[model samples]
Target: EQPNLYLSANAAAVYSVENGEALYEQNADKVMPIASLSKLMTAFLVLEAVDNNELSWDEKLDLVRLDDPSAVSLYAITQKRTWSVRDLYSAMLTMSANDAAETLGDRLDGADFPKEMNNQAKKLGMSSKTTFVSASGLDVDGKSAVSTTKDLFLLSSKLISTHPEVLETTSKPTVTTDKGAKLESTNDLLGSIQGLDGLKTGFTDEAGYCFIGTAERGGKRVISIVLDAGTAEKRFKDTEKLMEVGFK
Candidate 1:
């Protein structure tokens, strides 16, 4: 059975799935600002690098500053602090740490990430509805970083299948940093429902509240993307309802 997908009056997109195919969709192909949800893509590339040995999970890299527009970022390192590749990934995924994100981008290609990211977009066949200007989803003048719901779902599925450990980190409700600092998963569904694996939650004023939620029920893995919802509370409430419907 297919689930009924509903949205607040403000949603830009809503998707419901059955056996990995969208049973209902809205604006699935429309490009919209994705905010910190963009971190999932960054984390994907980082994990790919780790799998390829270009980077290591335990190798510590120092944060670099490249101007960001977001005002709510945590771990905004002004002084260089070395962090494990895994820790940086955690900070980026859990707290949307802009500093950690910039450090990872620098590791990907020093002073050439913007160009390299565009190159990756071309290589990944995400040309039609994906564009990234910064490693972190900071608003740049008027050129808001954009992605389509379909692309995000595809990205989520790839990450879950290829980098199960990354999802392991995202699934944790809370984790401690090496320095004893505590961080929590931004994804509410991680702790709120059963059979829910981890994916991501993202928000910025420009992007609204967005969530890419994945779960396995009856041995079938399902993914849902909710975009441009009004509030974090609303996003979670809507997601829980969507998944309940999917399971029934």
Candidate 2:
């Protein structure tokens, strides 16, 4: 048995990805704002569309046309021209570029994007408690997206198992656009923690600091979640402690 681990986050979970075993949990079922962590499902759907030949990584999209000032797109929105789907996808995950996510959503389906997001969530067996109002995880029409730690783990596992390539993008310390703009990943644990790789992070006034993190050590892989941690640094600190105890 693993020793009890204490975390600062309001909710958390750790699971073995290789064997599908529950390692630990704290208020895992409680619903809370996930912030940009919601983009994992959005990325999954984009990959699925690629697999179905509806979209291509090489396809170029116009960023200015899909611009949303409300999105957390400090870097991406500045491009102001056409960008390949891969670059936008990279920016979306690495930087949590809300504009990239919204652009991708518009590419998939305008006006009806949220409907399709919810439908895809249901198809993935996500709990009804997990609801998405926007692809960018931004508050839209005065509403923000919400999900539980357990549900996020489920989504993360599915994404890792089905579309492992996402890690290739998420694990990168930084990605440069065609125009030489560098976008650094928001996931701080990538370099700080042993064996930790790609995943995502989120922060909003409503969500606090949230992270969906994955790591592999000695052939064993683990997925962990930390939600509603009080500060930007606390989430990573809590996740590191969780991973340490989880690997034991």
Candidate 3:
């Protein structure tokens, strides 16, 4: 397939996931706003909590929706609501639920979300291309919360290797709330091609369009991240092309 290419005028990196390496790049180490992609790290920390028995998948967390200047919540809180860890995960990984992310962060950080996120990024060895001002990538006032495609790919590999079960949840194209509210995957490529799994997607006025898509083919799995693309359509095409080239 001929790959379609469109990037943000200011895009700084290109990362390919083949043989577990970038294999090609251009200014790939530059860190910039990652938008909703920050949820990957947020999900990682939540999974760690589950593994350590600090939280259960079904644990109910009480959340109050307040005007969070730095978050892009999936659902607005006109009234307080309770959500399970499982529900929050679904919202985050599927819908890129900003509210769900904030709820989880609030439960874990208790009004200190940014502080905790920065510390976790440091602990995970994301020194060169990692920062977190919010559990959800909604902060637009600054560029300090950013990451490179290289760092994202490495993080993706680690997450898949260490927590394979995450895919079981992330790969699902849709889910419904106990109240029967239906949610669909933001990932446009879920059923468009074979071997396509799941990761994350993000966009903002400042970040343009972004995605981290993973797929398995020929007994190998590759993770590709295309950031700051010109549009959602272009990001999907770019990812498919990246996979095609990598599989070869």
Best by TM-score: 2
- TM-score per candidate, in order? 0.87, 0.93, 0.86
**How well is each residue in 11-101 modelled by candidate 1, as lDDT tens digits?**
4333334345665467777878887777777887888788787888788888765465444454543233777877788889887787788
Index of the highest-lDDT prediction:
2
Query: Candidate 2 residues 1-248, lDDT tens each?
Result: 65577777899889898787878888889999988998998899899999999999888887634344555783544746667888888888999888788888889998688899889889988998999998888877778899998789889999988998888888889888765678888888788888888699999878889998899899888999999999989999999888987688
Candidate 1: list runs displaced more than 4 Å.
1-5, 9-19, 66-70, 76-80
Worst 10 residues of 2 by lDDT: 62-71
Which stretches of candidate 3 lie above 4 Å from their native place?
1-19, 64-72, 77-80, 140-144
* Candidate 1: pairs in clash: none
Which scores higher on lDDT, 1 or 2?
Answer: 2
lDDT of 3 by residue, 35-55 (tens): 888888888888888898888
**Model 2: residues with Cα > 4 Å off, grouped in runs:** 64-70, 74-79
In candidate 2, position 170 carries an lDDT of 86
Query: In order, what lDDT does every prediction score?
Result: 0.73, 0.85, 0.74
